[PDB]
Amino acid sequence: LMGPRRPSVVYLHNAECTGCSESVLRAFEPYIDTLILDTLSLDYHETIMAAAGDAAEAALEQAVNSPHGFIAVVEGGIPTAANGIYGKVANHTMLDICSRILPKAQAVIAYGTCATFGGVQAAKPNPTGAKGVNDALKHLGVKAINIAGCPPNPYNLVGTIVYYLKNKAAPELDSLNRPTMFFGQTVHEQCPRLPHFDAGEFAPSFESEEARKGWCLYELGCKGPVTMNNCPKIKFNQTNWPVDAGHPCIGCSEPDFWDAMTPFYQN
Amino acid sequence: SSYSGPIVVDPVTRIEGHLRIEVEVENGKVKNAYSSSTLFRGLEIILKGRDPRDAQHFTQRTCGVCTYTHALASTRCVDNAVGVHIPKNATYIRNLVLGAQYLHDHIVHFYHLHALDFVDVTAALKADPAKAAKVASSISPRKTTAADLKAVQDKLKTFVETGQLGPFTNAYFLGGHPAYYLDPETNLIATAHYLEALRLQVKAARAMAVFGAKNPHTQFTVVGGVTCYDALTPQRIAEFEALWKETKAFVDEVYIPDLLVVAAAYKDWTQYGGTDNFITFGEFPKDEYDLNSRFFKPGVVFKRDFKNIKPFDKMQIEEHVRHSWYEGAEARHPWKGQTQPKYTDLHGDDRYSWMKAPRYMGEPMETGPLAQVLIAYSQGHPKVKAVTDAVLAKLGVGPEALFSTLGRTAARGIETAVIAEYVGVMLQEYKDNIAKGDNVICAPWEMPKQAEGVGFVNAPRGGLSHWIRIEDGKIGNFQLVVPSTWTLGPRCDKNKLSPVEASLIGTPVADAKRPVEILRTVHSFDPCIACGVH
Ligand code: SF4
C-alpha cells in the first residue's frame, strides 16, 4: 500500500462532484503517472483504486495507521445536518470519517471550494448542513491548507505538495488559509481585458460587437475584481481560461461564492 | 466454495460518487440486489428562487466526470424556456465540445475505471515483452516493440518492489483470482495502455478547453449561444483539430483493439447483466427544437423489441420515491417534481437510496451507450451499423450477445469510435459555415415571467433532462433527471427492479470476499452517483 520511501497520500471524497479529482488527472509536467509512480504513494482514492468494499476500507485503515505518516487530501464539503446522515461511506458518516482520520494526518490539504469553504451544496438553503473542512472540524484542531477553486488549478495542488515535501511546512497562507504563492493576486489585476476596464469599455451583451472585440466583461457580471486565483497566468489545460473564452469569472475560488457572486450576470 | 448469504460492496470504487451495492447470493449466484446511493446534496432545492441564467453554473457541479453535460442541459433548458433559437455556430461549438467530452469520458472509463476488473496488473510482471509486443502489433496498425513494453514492465517492477502498491493495494487480483483470465502478455499490453491513457486523456480534455475555457467545468455557454469568439479563429480550430485527431487515433488504434482482445477472453460475460428496456434522447442536433434532427435519434424500446421502436414522449417520465429517502410515495413528472428529503436508514420503511426511481410508461429503462447504439442500429444508422457489425464479426458472436455486461462494454467502445469520426464531420461543417461568412455565436433573448422549459442531452451515460418552471422570472422549480438515476436508481412503487438491480440477478461469484463479478456488471453501466442524486 505504503510504508517506506514515497510519501503516503490518503485522498478522501465527501460531498463532491469528482471535478476536483478530475482536475488532478489533468496534471501537466509532472503528469499524473509520474505523481503516483515516482513522487507520491496514492494509498486511498475511491475513483481509481482497484480494491472495493471491505478491501478498500482495509487499505484506508492500513494507510492511516502507518507509522510512516500520511498527508490527507480532501475533496468535498462535509454534510453535518441530521448528525451527518446525508453523506455516508461504508455506512459511516463523512463527518465521522473525517473526524477520525484528519487529526491523524501529518498535513491536510482541502482541495476545491467545497472542501475549503463548503461549496455548492452549502449554498442557500444548505439542506445538508455542508461545511468546509476547517469549519466542520475546528474543534479537533484541524487546519487544512485551502486550495480553492471549482475546481482549482491542479498546478496549485502539486505546487503545494511539492513545497510541503521539500520544506516540511506549509507555504505562506492568506487569511482564508490559501497559499499566497497562488492566491495572492486578483484574477482581474492579471486580466488581459484590464485596459478596457480602465477605459470603461464594457461589452453590453454577449452578441455585441464589443464582446467580439474582447471588451471587458464586468457589465456582464465578471467577478474577477473580487476573486483571488491565478487563472490568467497559469491558464487551464495549458491553453485557456474563462475570460479568454469570452465568459465572466463567476468567483469560484471565494468562500460562499454561490450566494455572494450571484446573480452571476450582474455587477 | 459456493457461497450463500449476503455480500455488500461499500464503497463501490472506480465509479463517480458514493454507491453501496447489496446482494443476496444463493449457491454462488446472485438472487437479489439493491442499488443504494449514499450521498445527497440537494441542488434542486438550492436552485429554487434563483435567476434561471445561474442554473447552468450550479448544475454543472452535479458532476465533474460528465463535466459540461449539465451546463449544456441547463442551457438547452433555459434556451427552450425563453424561446431562443441559438445561432448555427453555437450549435456547432456546443456539439464539438460534447463530442470531445464523450471521447475523454469513455477512454478514462474503460482504462481507469473498468479495466482493473479484468486486468491483473501484477501478472504483467511475469510477461514475455517480446511475445506481448507481437500480440499488440497483431491487433492494431500501431506497431509496438519488445523494448516499448519492457520499459513499462521495468517501471512497474520498480513500483511493485517498493511494496507501496498505492492504487493496487488489496486488489481483487493480488495473489491470483479464479475470475481473472488474461495471460501475462495481455495483462502487460492493457497495463501499458492504461498508463498511456493517463497522458492521452490530458489531450482529450484539453480539446474541450480550446473552445470551452477549461476542463473540468467549462465556461463558454450562455442562454442564446456561446461566448467564445476566439473559437471562430483558424488557430483555435487547428488546435482543436490536432487534439481531436490524436484522441481519435488512440480510440481507433489502442482502445478499440484492447476492448476486443479483452472481450474475446471474457466471452462468458455475454451471459450476464442483461436488461429489458432502453431509452435514449438523441444527440448532436441540427435543430435545437427537433430531437429527430440529431445525429443519434431518440427512441424507446420495451422487452428488447427493436423492431418496434417507440417514439419518446417526454410526458411519460415519472420519478418514484417509494423506495427512496424522500417524503411519501408519489411519483412525479419533473415539471411537477418534488425533492423533499426524508432519511429512514438502510431499508427503513423499504427505502434504501438517495436516488429517485425514474420510470417510462411505468417501466425501468437502461440508458447510455448500449441504449444509444442499439436504438441507432435499429433505426438504420449507417455508421453505428458498420462499427457494430464489425465488432460482432471480430468477436464471433451474434447480436444477442449485446444484451449483457460484455455487450454494454462493447457498446461504449462502438459509440466512442462512431462519435470520434463524427466530430470530424461536425468540424468540417463548422469550418464551412464560417467560410460562408457566418460569424455569429450568440442570439438575443428575453426572460419570460412565466414559462416551462426542458433541455435534453444524450450524455456519455445516457438520457439527461433538465426541467424548469419559471415563475416571476425566477426558478419556480428546477428538476434534473439524470442517466444514472434511470439506470442505478432503486425500485419504484410497483416494486420493479431498476436496470442495474435486475442485471445483477444471475451473477456468479467465485469468491465472495473478492466479488469482482459484481463490479464488472456495475461498472459496465458506468455509474455516476453525484449525477444520479444531485
Ligand atoms: S469544488 Fe467544485 S469541482 Fe470540486 S468537488 Fe466541489 S463542486 Fe466539484
Ligand code: SF4
Ligand atoms: S473581464 Fe473581468 S477580470 Fe478582466 S478586466 Fe474585465 S472585470 Fe476584470
Ligand code: F3S
Ligand atoms: S470562475 Fe474560477 S476558474 Fe478562475 S476565472 Fe474565475 S476563479
Ligand SMILES: [Mg+2]
Ligand atoms: Mg432530480
